Symmetry: C3
Subunit: 131 residues, 3 copies
C-alpha cells in the first residue's frame, strides 16, 4: 500500500492508471507511432519515469489481449525496473506474428507496470550444498 513517484516526461499522455482495484499493474502508453514488421522489434518510449522504492522492483509485462490478437510481445519480458533507475521507461516491443504487421499508435496501451518487493539477497559462496 506504497506510493510510486512518477514524472510524465511527455505531458501529452495520460498518467498511467490502475484499471480496477486489485489490478496488478498500471498500463503504460506509447509516446510514439511505430510499425513493427513481422519478426521486427523496437524500443518504444513511454513518456514516463518512475522511482521504484528501495527493496522493490518494477516489472514491465506484455498485455495479454494484444499478445493473442496480433502476436505483440516484449523481448526482455518481464522488463526489470531497478529502484535507482530514473531514466525513461522504454518497452522493447516485438511482432511475433509470421506475416501481419503491428501498428502502434501514440496513445495506445503497450504494456503494464507492476510493482513488487524483491529480496536483495547477499550471495554467500559455498563449497557445496548440504545433503
Amino acid at each position: 500500500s506504497t506510493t510510486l513517484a512518477i514524472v510524465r516526461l511527455d505531458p501529452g499522455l495520460p498518467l498511467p492508471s490502475r484499471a480496477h482495484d486489485g489490478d496488478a499493474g498500471v498500463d503504460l502508453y506509447s509516446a510514439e507511432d511505430v510499425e513493427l514488421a513481422p519478426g521486427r522489434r523496437a524500443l518504444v518510449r513511454t513518456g514516463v519515469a518512475v522511482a521504484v522504492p528501495f527493496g522493490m522492483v518494477g516489472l514491465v509485462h506484455p498485455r495479454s489481449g494484444l499478445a493473442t490478437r496480433v502476436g505483440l510481445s516484449i523481448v526482455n519480458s518481464p522488463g526489470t525496473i531497478d529502484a535507482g533507475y530514473r531514466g525513461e521507461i522504454k518497452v522493447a516491443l516485438i511482432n511475433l506474428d509470421p506475416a501481419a504487421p503491428i501498428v502502434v499508435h501514440r496513445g495506445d496501451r503497450i504494456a503494464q507496470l507492476l510493482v513488487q518487493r524483491v529480496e536483495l539477497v547477499e550471495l554467500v559462496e559455498v563449497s557445496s550444498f548440504d545433503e
Copy 2:
C-alpha cells in the same frame, strides 16, 4: 511459510486439479483442456479448464515450463501472464511455437504452463514535476 489458500473451480471436470509437485515449488502446473497443434512460429489461446480467485493484494502469474521450452521451443507470448485478483474467468494460455521447423502437438491433459501467486504492491501513483524538484535525483 504459512500462506493462504487459493479457491479453484474446475470448469472442465475431466482434467486433474492443478497441484504443487513439491513443497517449495513456486507454482502449480496447468493442463490443456484441448488438443492443439502449433506449426512453427504459430500461436494459440489454449484453455486450462480452471478459474481462480487470486486474493486481494496478490497476483497470479503464468510462467512457461522450462522443459518443453528447451525440448520443443514452446513459449508463451504474454509471459508472464498476469491474472488479476478480481478476475473470475477461465485461465487461458497464449502458447506459441518458437521453433523454426518442427510443429508442436499439444494434447488435452498435458501440463502446458505453471501458475505462481505472489503479493503485489498496489502502488498509488504520485506525479511529480521532476525527480530533482521532488528530491529524487
Copy 3:
C-alpha cells in the same frame, strides 16, 4: 538481509553480483561460447547453482540491453528456480532477430537472477464463483 548460498561449479567465472544497491537481480555469466543463428535457441550453462530459500523463488530475467540490441531473449522467461532445486542454473537463450546471428562468449552477462517470496498457496476446489 536474506543470504543466498551459491556454488561456482565453474571456478573460472566471477561470482554473480548486484551492480547497484537496490538492483533487483544479479547478472549470471555464460560458461560457454555459443552462436545462435536467427530463430535458433540453445540451453546455456551459467557455471553456478544456488539454493533458493523455502518460501522464495528464483527468477531468470533477460537483460534489456541485448534484447533490444541483438534480439536475444529467453524461451521460458521468466525462468523459475524452485526452492528444491540444487542443480546448475541454465538459460534458454533464443535469437529472435530475423537475420543477424548472435554470438555469446564465455564470460558474457547473459541473464539476471532475482529472488522473491512466493505464496505457497493451498488450492481448494470449490463449486463456483
